[PDB]
Amino acid sequence: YTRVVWCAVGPEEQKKCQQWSQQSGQNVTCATASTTDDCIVLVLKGEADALNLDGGYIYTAGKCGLVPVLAENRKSSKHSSLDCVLRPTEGYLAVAVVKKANEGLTWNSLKDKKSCHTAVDRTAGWNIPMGLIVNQTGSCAFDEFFSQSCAPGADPKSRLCALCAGDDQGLDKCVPNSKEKYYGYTGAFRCLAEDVGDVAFVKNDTVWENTNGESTADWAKNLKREDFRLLCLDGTRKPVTEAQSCHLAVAPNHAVVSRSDRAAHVEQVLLHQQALFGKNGKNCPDKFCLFKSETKNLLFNDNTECLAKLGGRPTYEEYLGTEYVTAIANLKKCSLEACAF
Ligand SMILES: *[C@@H]1O[C@H](CO)[C@@H](O[C@@H]2O[C@H](CO)[C@@H](O[C@H]3O[C@H](CO)[C@@H](O[C@@H]4O[C@H](CO)[C@@H](O[C@@H]5O[C@H](CO)[C@@H](O)[C@H](O)[C@@H]5O)[C@H](O)[C@@H]4O)[C@H](O)[C@@H]3O)[C@H](O)[C@H]2NC(C)=O)[C@H](O)[C@H]1NC(C)=O
Ligand SMILES: *[C@@H]1O[C@H](CO)[C@@H](O[C@H]2O[C@H](CO)[C@@H](O[C@H]3O[C@H](CO[C@@H]4O[C@H](CO)[C@@H](O)[C@H](O)[C@@H]4O)[C@@H](O)[C@H](O)[C@@H]3O)[C@H](O)[C@H]2NC(C)=O)[C@H](O)[C@H]1NC(C)=O
Ligand SMILES: *[C@@H]1O[C@H](CO)[C@@H](O[C@@H]2O[C@H](CO)[C@@H](O)[C@H](O)[C@H]2NC(C)=O)[C@H](O)[C@H]1NC(C)=O
Ligand SMILES: Nc1ncnc2c1ncn2[C@@H]1O[C@H](CO)[C@@H](O)[C@H]1O
Ligand SMILES: [Fe+3]
Ligand SMILES: [Zn+2]
Ligand SMILES: [Zn+2]
Known part of the structure; x- marks a missing residue:
């Protein structure tokens, strides 16, 4: 049937x-x-x-x-009476996270620092942060802004894949699937936590789910929230509890x-x-x-x-909203009606 x-x-x-x-x-x-x-x-x-x-x-x-x-x-404070299946979605906060210990690193000094991205073409890990970087840079040169990165799905031999590790044994480097150690929200945050990169572009939820005992994975079990900071667009740095005032954008749910x-x-x-x-x-x-x-x-x-x-x-389009849909169109002039295939 x-x-x-x-x-x-x-x-x-x-x-x-x-x-x-x-x-x-x-x-x-x-x-x-x-x-x-x-x-x-x-x-x-x-x-x-x-x-x-x-x-x-x-x-x-x-x-x-x-x-x-x-x-x-996901779980909500407001909209609480309604059943989950009927409740409208709230979106998620895309943020840029750094180590508190890495002082004087702001949104405005990210130039030639090391970056960890979920994957190429994803919302918080790529489209939002690069969309912004291209716009305030004038240049469509996004592959030359960071000195080295892990950006799963980019050319293996470029600087955008330099920080990627592949699997168990070194194969599948920079593949945009979970064989790659630094793929996705969890991987990108791991890339930062292990000091492979200076900045990770993930969402707010990721920080709270892999710190203070919430994860039992061994790379994350000793991690503390106070050891990280969010980078706001106004050039300041805030504790992670402040994502509602320090985010790059709100993303449509998966x-x-x-x-x-x-x-x-x-x-x-x-x-x-x-x-x-x-x-x-x-x-x-x-x-x-x-x-x-x-x-x-x-x-x-x-x-x-x-x-x-x-x-x-x-x-x-309605689902992604006009806001985000234009952010993507603009980014894609760099690298209007189509279908990749
Ligand atoms: C960034 O991401 C993190 C991770 O996603 C977000 O934090 C998570 O937020 C969720 C909910 O937003 C939180 O849920 C916990 O909250 C309490 C803690 O015990 C638990 O249960 C409570 O249940 C009651 C009723 O069900 C309710 O309180 C009631 O409030 C009313 C009105 O205010 C009042 O009359 C009474 O006080 C009531 O009792 C609460 O809503 C609450 O749900 C939950 O079951 C659950 O444990 C997660 O714990 C938290 N995740 C983690 C890992 O910390 C964060 O919100 C995001 N921030 C931003 C900026 O968006
Ligand atoms: C990179 O750079 C470009 C440069 O702007 C930027 O592109 C876009 O920026 C604007 C944001 O979407 C967009 O403006 C359009 O949105 C207007 C807003 O609509 C209005 O909202 C009110 C408030 O409730 C409503 O009542 C009502 O809907 C109202 O219309 C809308 O009026 C128009 O459509 C605007 O055009 C702008 O068009 C667009 N510019 C370009 C060049 O395409 C990207 O967002 C930047 N990238 C990143 C990541 O920031
Ligand atoms: C596989 O398909 C159906 C989904 O509804 C399930 O079997 C149905 O059971 C109900 C109640 O007994 C019947 O009204 C349906 O007609 C059944 N399906 C048919 C067409 O045979 C079954 O539970 C599903 N399997 C699982 C475990 O997900
Ligand atoms: N609280 C909010 N503030 C602004 N935009 C939102 C919010 N909640 C969801 N969205 C946006 O709504 C769009 C889907 O209609 C998504 O692209 C998402 O970014
Ligand atoms: Fe996402
Ligand atoms: Zn906002
Ligand atoms: Zn419609």
Whole structure:
């Protein structure tokens, strides 16, 4: 009857997907690709049905005619009465984080310092910070601003990949999937924590989830929040508790995309799947939890409370908002109607 094919990016997501596939009685199955771009192509071809994406990729996917189905929703103070599935999403804060110990480093002295990015083309790790850097720089030269970086998905042999480490044994350097040690929110923050870079571009949640005992990963277990600072755009430095006054931008939540002709079908099965393995699901802690992967953010961010319905039936532009959509257009003149494929 109603069977959905999920697209996993890399071997670790593949493994989580296989687990979810087993436990769902094959109501969901898995396709695997090496990168997000490749997963998008599988969906266009019709060989995969769906995957969850950061806003940067929702933009790529959108030009290709894919559509947002459901969005990640995390815990909230305000909007509290409403059920998670119906509650509007709040977005996330993209911030630039540094070590307190690295004094006199401000937004205005980042020139030729070392940077850690989640990946190329992602919202907090790339589009926002580079969008800003290009704009206040006049130059589309973003690859020469930092002396060295880890920016997964850039040319392996460039300075933008210099700080990337690859895997266990040094392979897959700078691949934009979790084989790369410094990939994604967790990896970029690890890049800073281990003093590989001077600055990481992540979101506010990442700092709080890998400090003060929240993570039990060994590179993060001794980390303290007071040891970091946020860099604000006004040239000041603030404690991490101040993200609401010291952020680069507010980002649209990650969301599930699918081909438009499959949207309804994909929506139905996942609402059912989340009842079963979601945050309150018939079986989260006993058999399987869709929203956990021990801080690795596999398939979905681990802080996800549920996947929310989008009311207003957004096109991908409305979903990303005009604000962010122009930020991307502008950045992309550097490196108007298209679809990468
Ligand atoms: C940056 O990111 C970090 C990490 O995401 C954010 O911090 C996280 O924020 C969440 C919620 O925003 C926080 O949740 C904890 O909060 C309390 C602590 O015990 C727990 O339960 C509480 O429950 C009650 C009711 O459910 C409620 O209090 C009530 O408030 C009303 C009205 O104000 C009042 O009448 C009474 O006082 C009520 O009791 C609270 O809302 C609260 O939820 C939660 O279950 C949970 O433990 C996370 O702990 C926190 N994450 C971490 C790891 O620290 C941060 O907000 C982001 N900042 C910015 C700037 O956006
Ligand atoms: C890099 O550099 C460019 C240079 O501007 C910048 O591009 C864009 O900057 C503006 C921000 O989006 C954009 O202005 C448009 O937005 C206007 C706002 O709409 C108004 O809001 C009110 C408030 O509630 C509403 O009532 C109502 O919707 C109202 O219209 C809108 O009026 C117009 O569409 C404006 O054009 C500007 O057009 C755009 N400029 C260019 C060159 O495209 C990028 O954002 C910069 N990049 C980064 C990362 O900052
Ligand atoms: C796989 O598909 C369906 C999703 O609803 C589930 O089986 C359904 O169970 C209900 C109630 O017993 C029936 O009304 C449906 O008709 C059943 N589906 C069909 C068409 O056979 C089943 O739970 C799902 N598997 C899991 C574990 O996710
Ligand atoms: N509190 C907020 N302030 C400003 N913009 C927001 C906020 N919440 C969500 N957004 C934006 O709404 C857009 C989706 O309509 C997203 O791009 C997101 O950036
Ligand atoms: Fe993101
Ligand atoms: Zn703001
Ligand atoms: Zn509309």
